[PDB]
């Protein structure tokens, strides 16, 4: 049952004004919430995300596309926001019962928003979207934790190894620390780790597998120097002890992949790079005979975090060519900003982005504008 033609009208002539509200509806909601919910802090919810403020809104406004989504194309789901989500939330381990809770404060804060104007009729139509959504979400979220090869939504592992690889990358790597079975990653996909922030609260983070035995973890952390956790994370000394969640994501090798002999198109920037060496390891196990045009972005090639390692694997490839770009210094294959006008991109080509969010933004433009389609455009962005 999709949204029901009562409840239509309504979302239509209040659209608008939710939308408007929702800034202000949020660090409501959640005040609310976490008020009567501490332990939602302590292992679940980011409290960067809360002070920053715009980042938090993503849950109501996600409603709001949604609602906008679900008026014009009825009876169906966007399945990439559905997707997206679902996997962070399996990653945190996010039950369905929460869903009442996130319910119970996010309408009492619209109620306490509109006042008398949150009316029957307005509160109606929108619960209705709201458990459209979560019905939807916590039947993808089941199906993920079905494919889990444990019964757990985290298990301690020990930092086994770590190194400073540039002035702030550390390449760490993890091993069970308990008898926990771990599901075997697909290249792309993501873990969420866990630590103590200095007053005691456990934080999550997702950090992007790399490659290692299957009996580890590896991940590579960039200093945030305005962050709480990647400092903590940093100096954990070989031999902490800490929990690390199911590996999960959608943006995978096979999602790139739309026909068997497509060519792909991998550009990065910065630490955006680690999902890049998970492909590339993973196409060069594969034998893969795709052409594979790898784009790096540094600021320098010595602060190319993993370069020596991507370019080792891309050597095993076919049909790979590795370009890395120099910002600030002037070493690289190239220097300053990628020009997409320069690159033969075939129109069968997928063409993967992860970096900051203004370089995808440019990259993504300047694609469009240099006629790549959208569809063959993937992204992943970091928090
Ligand atoms: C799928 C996925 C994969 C990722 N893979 C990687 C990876 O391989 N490597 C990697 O290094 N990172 C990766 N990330 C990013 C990572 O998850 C973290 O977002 C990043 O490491 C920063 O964490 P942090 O705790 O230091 O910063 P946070 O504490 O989360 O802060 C983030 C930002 O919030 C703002 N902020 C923080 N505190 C406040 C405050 N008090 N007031 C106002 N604003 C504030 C600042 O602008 C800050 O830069 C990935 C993210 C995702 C979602
Ligand atoms: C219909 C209900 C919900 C919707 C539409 C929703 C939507 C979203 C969206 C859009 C994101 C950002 C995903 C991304 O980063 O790409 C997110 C993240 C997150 N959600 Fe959900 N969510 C819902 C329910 C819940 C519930 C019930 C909980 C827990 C009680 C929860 C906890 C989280 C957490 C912890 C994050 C990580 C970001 C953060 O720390 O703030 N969500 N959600």
Redesign the pocket.
């Known amino acids: 049952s999709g949204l029901s033609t009562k409840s239509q009208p309504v979302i239509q002539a209040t659209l608008p004004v939710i939308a408007e509200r929702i800034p202000h509806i949020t660090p409501v909601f959640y005040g609310d ?1 976490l008020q009567a ?1 501490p332990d ?1 802090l302590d292992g ?3 409290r960067s ?2 002070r920053d403020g715009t ?2 809104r ?6 709001a596309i ?1 609602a906008q989504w679900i008026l014009q194309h009825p009876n169906t789901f966007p399945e990439e ?1 559905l997707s ?2 679902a996997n ?2 399996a990653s ?1 381990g ?1 039950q369905p019962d ?2 009442d ?3 119970k404060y996010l309408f009492g804060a619209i109620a306490k928003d509109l006042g008398d104007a949150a009316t029957p009729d307005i509160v109606e139509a929108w619960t209705e979207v ?1 458990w459209l ?2 019905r939807a ?1 916590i039947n993808l979220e089941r199906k993920l934790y079905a494919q889990q090869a444990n019964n757990i939504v985290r298990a301690k592992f020990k930092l086994v190894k770590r190194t400073q690889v540039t002035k702030d990358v550390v390449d760490m790597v993890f091993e069970p620390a308990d008898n926990t079975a771990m599901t075997p990653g697909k290249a792309g996909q993501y873990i969420s780790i866990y630590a103590r922030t200095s007053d005691g609260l456990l934080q ?1 983070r997702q950090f992007t597998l790399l490659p290692s035995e299957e009996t580890q973890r590896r991940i590579a952390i960039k200093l945030d120097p305005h962050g709480e956790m990647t400092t903590i994370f940093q100096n954990q000394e070989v031999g902490a002890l800490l929990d690390i969640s199911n590996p999960y994501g959608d943006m995978t090798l096979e999602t790139l992949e739309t026909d068997p002999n497509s060519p792909l198109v991998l550009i990065c920037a910065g630490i955006g790079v680690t999902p890049v060496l998970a492909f590339v390891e993973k196409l060069a196990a594969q034998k893969s005979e795709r052409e594979v045009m790898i784009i790096a972005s540094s600021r320098s090639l010595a602060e190319a975090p993993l370069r020596g390692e991507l370019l080792e694997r891309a050597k095993e490839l076919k049909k790979a060519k590795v370009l890395y770009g120099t910002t600030q210094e002037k070493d690289g294959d190239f220097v300053g900003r990628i020009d997409v006008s320069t690159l033969d991109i075939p129109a069968n080509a997928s063409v993967f982005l992860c970096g900051p969010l203004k370089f995808m933004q440019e990259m993504r433009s300047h694609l469009v504008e240099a006629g790549i389609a959208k569809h063959k455009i993937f992204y992943e ?1 970091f ?1």
């Open positions: 919430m919910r939602l679940m919810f980011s995300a809360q980042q938090a993503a849950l109501a406004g996600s409603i949604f926001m997206r989500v962070k939330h945190l996010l929460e869903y809770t996130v319910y709201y959504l979560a979400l999550p962005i928090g």
